[PDB]
Amino acid sequence: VNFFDELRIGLATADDIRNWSYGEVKKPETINYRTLKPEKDGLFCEKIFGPTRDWECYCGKYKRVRFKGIICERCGVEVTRAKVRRERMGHIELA
Amino acid sequence: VSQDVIVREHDCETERGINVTLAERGPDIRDAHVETSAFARTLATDAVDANGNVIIERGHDLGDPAIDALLAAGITTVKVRSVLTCTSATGVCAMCYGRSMATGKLVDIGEAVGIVAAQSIGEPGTQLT
Amino acid sequence: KRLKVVAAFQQSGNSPMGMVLDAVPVIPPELRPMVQLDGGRFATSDLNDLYRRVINRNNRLKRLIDLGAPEIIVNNEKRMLQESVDALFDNGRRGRPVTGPGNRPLKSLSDLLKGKQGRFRQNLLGKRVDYSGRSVIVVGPQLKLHQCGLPKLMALELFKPFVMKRLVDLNHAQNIKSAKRMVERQRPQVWDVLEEVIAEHPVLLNRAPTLHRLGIQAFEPQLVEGKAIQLHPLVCEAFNADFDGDQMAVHLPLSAEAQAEARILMLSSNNILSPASGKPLAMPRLDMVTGLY
Amino acid sequence: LRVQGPREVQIHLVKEVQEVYRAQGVSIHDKHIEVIVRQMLRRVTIIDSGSTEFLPGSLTERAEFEAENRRVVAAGRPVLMGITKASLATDSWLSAASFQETTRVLTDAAINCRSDKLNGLKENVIIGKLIPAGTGISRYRNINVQPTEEARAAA
Amino acid sequence: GDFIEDSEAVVAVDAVSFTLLQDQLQSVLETLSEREAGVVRLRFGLTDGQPRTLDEIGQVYGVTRERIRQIESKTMSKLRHPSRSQVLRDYLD
Amino acid sequence: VTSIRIDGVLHEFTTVPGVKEDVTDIILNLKGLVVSSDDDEPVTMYLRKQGPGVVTAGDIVPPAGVTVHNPDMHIATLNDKGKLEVELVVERGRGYVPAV
Amino acid sequence: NSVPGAPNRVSFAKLREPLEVPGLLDVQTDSFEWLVGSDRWRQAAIDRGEENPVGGLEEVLAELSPIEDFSGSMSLSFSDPRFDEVKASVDECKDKDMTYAAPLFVTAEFINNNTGEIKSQTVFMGDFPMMTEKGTFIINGTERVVVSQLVRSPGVYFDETIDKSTEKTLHSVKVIPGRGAWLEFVRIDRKRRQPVTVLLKALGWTNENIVERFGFSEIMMGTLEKDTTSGTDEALLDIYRKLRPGEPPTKESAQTLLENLFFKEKRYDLARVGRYKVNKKLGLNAGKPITSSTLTEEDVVATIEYLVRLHEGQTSMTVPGGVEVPVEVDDIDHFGNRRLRTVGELIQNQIRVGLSRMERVVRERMTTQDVEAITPQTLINIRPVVAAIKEFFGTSQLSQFMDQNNPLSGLTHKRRLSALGPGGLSRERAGLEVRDVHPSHYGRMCPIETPEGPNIGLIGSLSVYARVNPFGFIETPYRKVENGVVTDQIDYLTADEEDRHVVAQANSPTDENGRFTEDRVMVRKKGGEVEFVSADQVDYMDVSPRQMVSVATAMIPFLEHDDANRALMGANMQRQAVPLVRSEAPLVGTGMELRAAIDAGDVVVADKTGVIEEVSADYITVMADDGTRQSYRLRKFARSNHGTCANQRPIVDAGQRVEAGQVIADGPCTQNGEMALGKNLLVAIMPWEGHNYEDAIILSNRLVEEDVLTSIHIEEHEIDARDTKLGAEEITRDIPNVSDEVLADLDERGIVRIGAEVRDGDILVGKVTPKGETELTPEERLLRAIFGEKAREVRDTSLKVPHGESGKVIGIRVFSREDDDELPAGVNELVRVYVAQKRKISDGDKLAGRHGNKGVIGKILPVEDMPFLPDGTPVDIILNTHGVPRRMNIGQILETHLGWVAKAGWNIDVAAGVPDWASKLPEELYSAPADSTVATPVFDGAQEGELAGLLGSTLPNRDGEVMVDADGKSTLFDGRSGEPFPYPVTVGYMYILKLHHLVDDKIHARSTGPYSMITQQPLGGKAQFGGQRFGEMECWAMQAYGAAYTLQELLTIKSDDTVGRVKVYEAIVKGENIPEPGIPESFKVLLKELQSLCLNVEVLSSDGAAIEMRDGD
DNA sequence: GCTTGACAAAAGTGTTAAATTGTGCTATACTGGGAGCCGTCACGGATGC
RNA sequence: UCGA
Ligand SMILES: [Zn+2]
Ligand SMILES: [Zn+2]
């Protein structure tokens, strides 16, 4: 749209950060050393940040654009565009 | 600091201004620099002589031909319209600023003079010691 | 001075609790990318390891708490978590920065915004643009004040999409694929087509550094042989461009509004006077002076 | 400034600034130096009162101070500040963030829950909007063009 | 970091070429039997996007999977024939 | 002369065995050739020199209707191992044309 | 001259060189020989100097010997460094991409006599990189050069400042060690707020001793009068806690801590240079054996005495029991206090770090590793040692890629002196005090030559006759003169020693027998300040002019007539020249080209007198008179490190006879043994119809037809076949999607054919990579069925020549894995293709003279229409007249007149009495043939009177007519108009160079290309095919005009708008209008970055509430 | 013009041999890191003394 | 590390 009057700043409360996040990253893992896939519950995990391939669940049950807005029951990845990986944020629950 | 300054309106209509030296104490002359100060300006209030002939009316562009006539009349001062006295709630008005230096005419309603002034001062800075 | 902060929290509705974090947001992956380049070797952003130090120390703290531990070990782990989050947001602001291999300080979220290399002065207040090029400048003493010599190879790549649609308009090529291959292969047909789109299509010339607005001026392109650029000798005073090997850049306006601003506002013939003192900036100088004198 | 008032400080600054540039043979116009000087004296200190969240020892714009001071249902003196301190006091918090001391500018804006109206041109440049100047003024860009009926008849 | 180009970034020419390629296939497939064109659309998926199979296409047109392979072969030889394929040579890749 | 051809070299940047010069330096020496041809269509001369000695401009056997006006020109110097076989294309034209 | 093959170039020098120019590569070779037991360096130290020479390796092994476990029961001793023959020839190293090194052997004895005694062994530290005969190194196949760093020598240097409190002067003292904690006067180890008198009580000094030494001139006595406590042991507890205050201090630990921190050699390492500096500077151990560790006490007692002495101003100070030495403040820039760390020493420091990094493993290993039987074989890990060497030659600022455009650039690089680097100042950290030339730079560092960028004053070139000391201080030769008579004696003086004498001027009157002819003579005192004295007080004299200027500077004719600025540009641009096809020596030039050419190493020299047996383009063979047979292989069209050609040509005839040191084959830029960096062109200086305007230049088309300015450029391309995660990469002709017509130039293997031509976009090497899953669209994969072309599992990744270049393929280099070869993990086949091209001189290419005159080519007129003499001989270059007077470089005019003088023959009448213009005239130079070469040494040159007289000369242009008058101007004829020019113009032969800055490399154009990953903006550089940066200052200019749409267009659809750029491309191709821009992608990234900092940011509409750019905002 | 049945290929599909992966454990006695840092310059304003 |  590119027509909006003002942009406001402020402080993000712990609840604001939790509402932004699509999941908690529970492990300091990036990618598998063999398959080079985004291992689950780490950084890059498709369960939260979104799929690597467009309209593809991690396990490959839903590979086509017919079904979107659904989450694979096995791999727990939502079927949508891979661009969401740019906009989707996680969070860490501190002890 | 000056990038947000642009010419918003034609005239602020205020009567305030500042004084220019314009040829002091000659002869028995003129001034070293009248082109940096008096030139390109716009007269704030009427310039009158000793007997009040009112040689040059308000708002004149104060070109070199106007300076000669002012010197012939014998007045050593003129109150000029400047951006310091300009009200113009937002930005500045074209009449207070003065003649556009590149155009040689009055300033357009769209000219952004803050960036132009910043570049005008900054560019020669390589020659200072 | 202490009141300003106390009053700031009083006027707004944000609780001061926001100054302590019970949760740390995680930046999306594509903004901290991990990708491979040559033959399998990998490259990743520094945030991933700064995050790693945070998550690793946070989980080790959970393990110490469940077992139960002397306060010496737990508190030591807690301050480690405190510095790991600090190093993530701003590295080096408190004590020594977290260093990588060879004593290189890791880039932190705050380092992304700050500095000449930050998001602002680097990727925001300035950007790298398409439809542009550069080359050396040579004197164009035979040019008109509004004209500039443009290398034919440069103009071909700059106007490539235009000449493509033109030789598709004409039957010289079928569809758009043979048009692109015909431009890339230099086949002689496109030369007559380039002069057609080049006509009365202005371009912007830039000579860095740009001190004033006259450092950028619009010209009418004239297809010229060779790889150099022909510049009008009068505009040299504006660009402060010596012919000792200076390089200049060219940009191509596209939308009708852009072309109009180049013809009216930024045309070379339109600005002959310095918009500071008022003295004419483009006037006979050097050879022309002694030539007329 | 403490003696001769605001209008004289602007005369003194332009005189001194032009004197340095004249010594090297550089000829500029006083109107330019006045454009820069005008921005230094646009703020006033608030000594007392304010009647509504106008704190003592604070620097607020004169025009905005004149509107709030009405409140017929605050006292201060004009100040003189450098261009850096003035450009850092701009009402646009991301304009000061892109200028200098990005870290300090951000923490202060977030604590005050500041809001940027996206008025100045540096803001419109960052967000990819049309700058509010030149051909970007609210008037020029809305111009409507139509052929005159007398001229259309020729076709 | 500034030297790594985005591999998945969309190229303009190929994206514009894909549209002009879609425009050309519509005209070529438009000249055919309305039932022959439907078999080719379901086979490769086209509009739907999911390539079907002979048996699935057999329930819609009410024929055996063998009868469609006959239709698929006859329409392919008609597609390979130069009047239709002379324009698509540039799109090999 | 337009183009030349040598059996042993596939390009201009290699040296021929047994000779003091290189192909580039030999071509820079061949530029000084002054030839005259009465045939519009192109024709090829031939030069073959074995054993030690100095190859000069007269060692080329001209086809029918062409001649060489400076046989004293120095081309190359070879030794016992040196052998030079080269054919050159003489053409008709005017002015200056670069390498095609 | 003085060289066997030296051609004949007459010199105008009024003096004779008493000293020959020393070996110009000695700076690199001498330091490297000192490092590794070179018997050549062993003799040098033995004949004059100590009888116990110690190599750089031997001295570091002496530091490491022995290694003890702290129990004293066992010890590990090192000794006897051993080197064997190099692993491979440098040619094979540069070819195989392997470093050029020789193995290292040593002796390590494991002794434990507490238990049963152990045994010795022979240890191998690793393959050690060795410096070549050219003074360079081969590291991983690339030719590199280790530069010489400028570091502040260890020692004591005192300064005086003006306190801000009062106008009275102050004195601060700083002792600078190499590895020490550097206490400063009395802050120690960077601990502020320190008293002066606490140290004596800290050292245990009795109170009565302070009064004796400090009683004179008050001062410290007053400082001793005011103190916290007077207790000797109490001062320990006061100072010991000040520095460390943590973990409460122990009584015994604090006593010996200062001896540990300073007196101990382990924590405080006494510098062998500083030991010499401070001992003789302060008078301690005067004329005593060296190699003393950190000063016990006496030296520190002299520092405090020197400080109080400096306040009083007493010049003569005798340390108690010591000698007397002047008391004065020191200048840091004086080359006596600033030394040059050489290549051998720089490598030594890295070996020291490698050995120190090893002992940590050995010390930790000897304790916990078995017992009694381990020996060095058990655990001695040399990985950290060799890593220190490998990590140094790369990544280090001192070790740089050899810069070689021409043999000059390579030579000047090796003698370079730069202050920046590890252990040195950063470029921003460096003040303006170092950049200014110091009076001590005379004859040592060249003041003219330096960079014009941010590096001004930091980088410099070592002088001609200078050479480095064993301690690192530069020495300069001088002719000792005693009692007003010049002597044959020559002594090398260095800084401090140079100030103790007065230096006569090299240029001075000399009688036949020899002596000071004039009554009053010039000299330069210890100021340095010029002085006019008499022969009585003169001791040393310059060996000759140009002692200061370096090689590149000394190669500029008429250097004294040009300003230092343009002279710096002329010297820098000389190393920026390029080898031409036929390089011809300069018509007029100083005699430095001869010597500098043979010392660069890029030419061929004969090392034995004899007769040539065979001559060929590939190699030359010489038969020595002693019976031996030597051969020299000629580098043929080798690609230089920067892309130029190194082709060499033989200058000798088969049956000729050579001599030791005589030239054989010329180098890339050379002619018959001299440095040829350019061509001699006929130049008329006049403005020509605006085509040469403001430094622009115009060329004669003859230069293009005759190739005089043509150069060759070779380029190297490389690609590898690696094992991938999904399979193996295959190099072949099988590229999946291509027309068979485009692969016609490939052989079966899939590479390009040698000798074939190419162009931007062609396939040099075809390759392939697997992909999966394929996942083809519905539309595509329909054509696969009709056209029956099976979609290949592999994806096409090939090697294609980039945009804007072409040429012929010179050669190929392929390393297969099937063939053993050598390859890193994952790679199978490695292929390199070498493409070259003949570059004609084109419009826009940069030409420059030797005086700093530079400019591009504005146009090239055909030979028909060009200003030409009455000869009918057209000129070559037309130089703009307006540029000569302003730039303050008039030497170009002098060499232009002299260039014409030397071109045509010239004969002096001389009559019977000779012209007086020739009283001090050149000797026996009166005559000279046509096209004669002449030499004009810098400060002994051809003077003004001679030039005028030289203009009168023989000018037989095919006939009797002379084409140049005595004023050097000729009447030119316009070839375009047909009428003569109205006035006489200056014509002559100048010497111009072709510079590596070429239009073909610099031209760049882009419409759409690769985009950055994080931000969608394009990239930079031509290699990446990137776009131009539209920066902050350029946006200001765009806003000053007031054009909003042009600015928004550049910052949205031109760059960061993901959906806008493809739509704009779609609109242009379809002929539609350009659509409306979107939001720059970098702004969305900016919001996400702010959200990571925990700043809640929202973009909200004027009405209602906030909106979302995407899933989140 | 379409269908049949037999028919081979392919595509899953469930089940088992296998590799990969994670956690625990080792009992002479051993208990507080080592690394380092020299060459701005000018300024403002807190913070610390 | 160099070019304006
Ligand atoms: Zn799934
Ligand atoms: Zn006004």
- Decide: CB of G1029 under 7 A of nucleic strand I: no
C137 in Cβ contact with C150 (< 8 Å): no
Note the maximum CA span of chain B: 49
CA angle (G442 as vertex; G436, G448 as ends), nearest 5 = 55
What is the distance between the alpha carbons of residues C35 and C39, in angstroms, rounded to a whole number?
Answer: 12
Chain E partners within 8 Å of A79 (Cβ): none
Beta bridge partners of G879: G685, G697
Which residues, in sequence order, are CB contacts of G109 under 8 Å at separation 6+?
A: G76, G77, G120, G121
What is the distance between the alpha carbons of residues G357 and G388, in angstroms, rounded to a whole number?
Answer: 9
Per the rule left: phi > 0, alpha: psi between -120 and 50, beta: everything else, G597 is alpha
C163 in Cβ contact with C190 (< 8 Å): yes
What does DSSP assign to residue G261?
Answer: I
Using DSSP bridges, classify how beta strands A21-24 and B92-93 pair: parallel, antiparallel or unpaired.
unpaired
Q: Which nt is closest to the CA of G420, judged by C1'? A: H39
Which helix (H) or strand (E) segment holds residue G684: the answer is strand G678-685
Helix axes G944-951, G891-903, angle to 10 degrees: 40
What is the distance between the alpha carbons of residues G788 and G792, in angstroms, rounded to a whole number?
Answer: 12
**Resolution value (Å, 1 decimal):** 3.2
What is the distance between the alpha carbons of residues G446 and G437, in angstroms, rounded to a whole number?
Answer: 9
Question: Residue D12 has which token pair?
Answer: 């003194």
Question: Residue A68 has which token pair?
Answer: 């979107």
What is the distance between the alpha carbons of residues G1075 and G1085, in angstroms, rounded to a whole number?
Answer: 23
Q: Which residue is nearest to nucleotide H3 (CA to C1')?
A: E64
Give whole-number Cα distances, A80 to A70, C69, F74, G518, in Å. Answer: 8, 45, 77, 97
Question: Residue G666 has which token pair?
Answer: 């010329």
Helices (H) and strands (E) in chain D, counts: 8, 3
Based on its alpha-carbon atoms, the radius of gyration of chain E, rounded to whole angstroms, reads 17
How far apart, in Å, do the first and last CA atoms of chain G sit?
A: 79
Q: How many residues does chain D have?
A: 155
Give whole-number Cα distances, G528 to A51, G438, G523, in Å. Answer: 75, 9, 10
Which residue in E90, E91, E92, E93 has the most chain C C-beta atoms within 10 A of its own C-beta, making it the best mutation to test that interface?
E90
| C-beta neighbour count of C211 within 10 angstroms | 21
Note the maximum CA span of chain F: 40
Beta bridge partners of G128: G102
Question: Residue D146 has which token pair?
Answer: 């139509």
Write down which chains contact chain B via at least 3 CB pairs under 8 A.
Answer: C, D, G
Its sign, for the CA torsion C58, C62, C65, C69, is: negative
User: What's the one-letter identity of residue C204?
Assistant: L
Neighbours of ion ligand 2 (CB under 5 A): B 12, 86, 88, 93, 96
Per DSSP (E only), the strands in G705-826 are: 711-722, 730-731, 757-759, 763-765, 767-770, 794-796, 799-800, 806-815
CA G75 to chain centre: 44
What is the distance between the alpha carbons of residues G818 and G828, in angstroms, rounded to a whole number?
Answer: 8
Using DSSP bridges, classify how beta strands G101-112 and G74-83 pair: parallel, antiparallel or unpaired.
antiparallel
The three-class DSSP label of residue G478 is strand
The three-class DSSP label of residue A51 is coil
- Decide: CB of G403 under 7 A of nucleic strand I: yes
| CA of E39, C1' of H10: distance in angstroms | 22
Question: Residue G839 has which token pair?
Answer: 């570059």
What is the distance between the alpha carbons of residues B121 and C276, in angstroms, rounded to a whole number?
Answer: 8
Q: How many residues does chain E have?
A: 93
C86 assigned binding-site residue: no
Residue G802: which of G756, G845, G763, G842 has the closest Cα? G763
User: What's the one-letter identity of residue C75?
Assistant: N
CA E63 to chain centre: 22
G674 in Cβ contact with G593 (< 8 Å): yes
What is the distance between the alpha carbons of residues C115 and G191, in angstroms, rounded to a whole number?
Answer: 32
Q: How many residues does chain C have?
A: 293
Q: How many residues does chain F have?
A: 100
Helix axes G383-393, G343-368, angle to 10 degrees: 160
What is the distance between the alpha carbons of residues G1001 and G802, in angstroms, rounded to a whole number?
Answer: 12
Using DSSP bridges, classify how beta strands G610-615 and G619-624 pair: parallel, antiparallel or unpaired.
antiparallel
What is the distance between the alpha carbons of residues C57 and G133, in angstroms, rounded to a whole number?
Answer: 56
G732 in Cβ contact with G768 (< 8 Å): yes
What is the distance between the alpha carbons of residues G319 and E17, in angstroms, rounded to a whole number?
Answer: 91
What does DSSP assign to residue G639?
Answer: B
Only one residue has tokens 């332009």, namely D14
What is the distance between the alpha carbons of residues G723 and G823, in angstroms, rounded to a whole number?
Answer: 12
Residue G327: which of G308, G343, G350, G310 has the closest Cα? G310
What is the distance between the alpha carbons of residues F22 and F84, in angstroms, rounded to a whole number?
Answer: 12
| Nearest-by-CA chain G residue for E12 | G1062
Residues of chain F by 3-state class (helix, strand, coil), percent to 5: 10, 35, 55
User: What's the one-letter identity of residue F34?
Assistant: V
C22 assigned binding-site residue: no
How far apart, in Å, do the first and last CA atoms of chain D sit?
A: 67
- Secondary structure of G100-155 in HEC code, one letter for each residue: CEEEEEEEEEEEECCCCCCCCCEEEEEEEECCCCCCCEEECCEEEEECEEEEECCE
User: What's the one-letter identity of residue G124?
Assistant: F
Question: Residue G320 has which token pair?
Answer: 């108690």
| CA of G1088, C1' of H20: distance in angstroms | 39
Only one residue has tokens 């009495």, namely G913
A72 assigned binding-site residue: yes
Buried (b) or exposed (e) across G449-477, using 16+ Cβ within 10 A?
bbeeeebebbbbbbbbbbbbeeebbbbbb
Which residues, in sequence order, are CB contacts of G926 under 8 Å at separation 6+?
A: G907, G908, G910, G918
Its sign, for the CA torsion G907, G912, G916, G922, is: positive
Q: Is F29 on the interface with G (CB under 8 A)?
A: no
The three-class DSSP label of residue G609 is coil
CA angle (B48 as vertex; B44, B54 as ends), nearest 5 = 95
Q: Is G865 on the interface with F (CB under 8 A)?
A: no
Residues from E in contact with G at Cβ < 8 Å: 1-6, 9-13, 15-16, 18-19, 21-22, 25, 40, 44-46, 49, 51, 76, 79-80, 85, 88, 91-93
C176–E4 CB contact, under 8 Å: no
What is the distance between the alpha carbons of residues G746 and G833, in angstroms, rounded to a whole number?
Answer: 12
Question: Residue C70 has which token pair?
Answer: 């002397």
Give whole-number Cα distances, F46 to B80, F57, F76, F77, F85, in Å. Answer: 92, 11, 15, 17, 8
Q: Which of D10, D25, D137 is nearest residue B110 as measured by Cβ atoms?
A: D137
What is the distance between the alpha carbons of residues G11 and G8, in angstroms, rounded to a whole number?
Answer: 10
Which residues, in sequence order, are CB contacts of B114 under 8 Å at separation 6+?
A: B1, B2, B3, B4, B5, B6, D35, D36, D39
A2–G1078 CB contact, under 8 Å: yes
CA B95 to chain centre: 9
Give whole-number Cα distances, G1018 to A86, C56, C152, C271, E17, in Å. Answer: 18, 36, 23, 32, 22
HSE of D15 in the Cβ direction (CA atoms, 13 Å)?
9
Per DSSP (E only), the strands in G823-931 are: 827-839, 847-849, 854-855, 857-861, 877-879
HSE of G291 in the Cβ direction (CA atoms, 13 Å)?
7
Which residues, in sequence order, are CB contacts of G779 under 8 Å at separation 6+?
A: E18, E21, E22, E25, E46
Question: Residue C261 has which token pair?
Answer: 């601003």
CA E9 to chain centre: 25
Residue C133: which of C203, C33, C73 has the closest Cα? C203
Chain G 633-652 residues in 7 Å CB range of strand I: none
G1036 in Cβ contact with C213 (< 8 Å): yes
User: What's the one-letter identity of residue G706?
Assistant: E
| Nearest-by-CA chain G residue for A16 | G1096
Question: Residue G364 has which token pair?
Answer: 């930790």
Buried (b) or exposed (e) across C159-191, using 16+ Cβ within 10 A?
bbbbbbbbbbeeebbebbbbbbebbeeeeeebe
Chain G 415-474 residues in 7 Å CB range of strand I: 418, 420, 451-453, 455, 459
Residue D47: which of D60, D35, D56 has the closest Cα? D56
G306 in Cβ contact with G266 (< 8 Å): no
CA distance B7 to chain G (A): 11
Sort G491 into a burial class: Cβ within 10 Å, 0-12 / 13-18 / 19+.
middle
Cα dihedral F71, F77, F79, F85 in deg (nearest 10): -70
Residue G602: which of G641, G634, G555, G572 has the closest Cα? G634
Edge to edge, what strands does the sheet with G148-152 contain?
Answer: G338-341, G148-152, G416-418, G459-461
G1006 in Cβ contact with G700 (< 8 Å): no
Q: Output phi, psi for G326, to 5 deg.
A: -50, 150
Sort D58 into a burial class: Cβ within 10 Å, 0-12 / 13-18 / 19+.
middle
Its sign, for the CA torsion G275, G277, G278, G279, is: positive
What does DSSP assign to residue G462?
Answer: B
CA angle (G238 as vertex; G233, G241 as ends), nearest 5 = 120
Dump the DSSP string for chain C: -HHHHHHHHHHSS--GGGGS-SEEEE--GGGS-EEE-STT-EEE-HHHHHHHHHHHHHHHHHHHHHH---HHHHHHHHHHHHHHHHHHHSSSSSSSPPB-TTS-BPP-HHHHHSSTTSTTTTTTS-EE-SSEEEEEEEE-TTS-TTEEEEEHHHHHHHSHHHHHHHHHHSTTSSTTHHHHHHHHTT-THHHHHHHHHHTT--EEEE-SS--SGGGEEEEEEEEESSSSEEE-GGGHHHHT--TTT-EEEEE---SHHHHHHHHTTSBTTT--B-TTT-SBSS---THHHHHH-
HSE of G432 in the Cβ direction (CA atoms, 13 Å)?
0
What is the distance between the alpha carbons of residues C10 and C15, in angstroms, rounded to a whole number?
Answer: 9
Its sign, for the CA torsion G784, G789, G794, G797, is: negative
| Nearest-by-CA chain G residue for E86 | G787
The three-class DSSP label of residue F23 is helix
Binding site membership of B for Zn(2+): which residues?
12, 86, 93, 96
Give whole-number Cα distances, F93 to F28, G169, G831, G865, in Å. Answer: 20, 87, 43, 21
Which helix (H) or strand (E) segment holds residue A64: the answer is none
Dump the DSSP string for B76-109: --EEEE-TTT---SSSEEHHHH-B-TTTSSBPPT
What does DSSP assign to residue G6?
Answer: -
Question: Residue G155 has which token pair?
Answer: 């020692």
CA distance A34 to chain E (A): 22
| CA of G792, C1' of H16: distance in angstroms | 35
Q: Cis bond leading into B52, ω under 30°?
A: no
Domains annotated on chain F, with CATH: 1-100 (2.170.120.12)
Give whole-number Cα distances, C218 to C163, C277, D140, G922, G959, in Å. Answer: 21, 22, 22, 60, 56
Q: Output phi, psi for E4, to 5 deg.
A: -90, 115
What does DSSP assign to residue E90?
Answer: G
Chain A partners within 8 Å of C26 (Cβ): 21, 25, 43, 89-92
Q: Which long-range CB contacts under 8 A does F37-44 form with residues at least 24 apart? A: F37/F65, F37/F66, F37/F90, F37/F91, F37/F92, F38/F65, F38/F66, F39/F65, F39/F66, F39/F92, F40/F92, F42/F2, F42/F89, F42/F90, F42/F91, F42/F92, F43/F89, F43/F90, F44/F87, F44/F88, F44/F89, F44/F90
- Secondary structure of G155-217 in HEC code, one letter for each residue: EEEEEEEECCCCCCEEEEEEEECCCCCCCECCEECCECCCCCCHHHHHHCCCHHHHHHHHCCC
What is the distance between the alpha carbons of residues G800 and G808, in angstroms, rounded to a whole number?
Answer: 14
G90 in Cβ contact with G138 (< 8 Å): yes
What is the distance between the alpha carbons of residues G389 and G1085, in angstroms, rounded to a whole number?
Answer: 43
What is the distance between the alpha carbons of residues G667 and G409, in angstroms, rounded to a whole number?
Answer: 13
Buried (b) or exposed (e) across D5-41, using 16+ Cβ within 10 A?
ebeebbbebbeebbeebeeeebbbbbbbbbbbbbbbb
| Nearest-by-CA chain G residue for D124 | G1048
Helix axes G298-312, G207-214, angle to 10 degrees: 40
Using DSSP bridges, classify how beta strands G857-861 and G697-700 pair: parallel, antiparallel or unpaired.
parallel
What is the distance between the alpha carbons of residues C76 and C59, in angstroms, rounded to a whole number?
Answer: 14
What is the distance between the alpha carbons of residues D123 and D113, in angstroms, rounded to a whole number?
Answer: 18
Q: Output phi, psi for G485, to 5 deg.
A: -135, 120
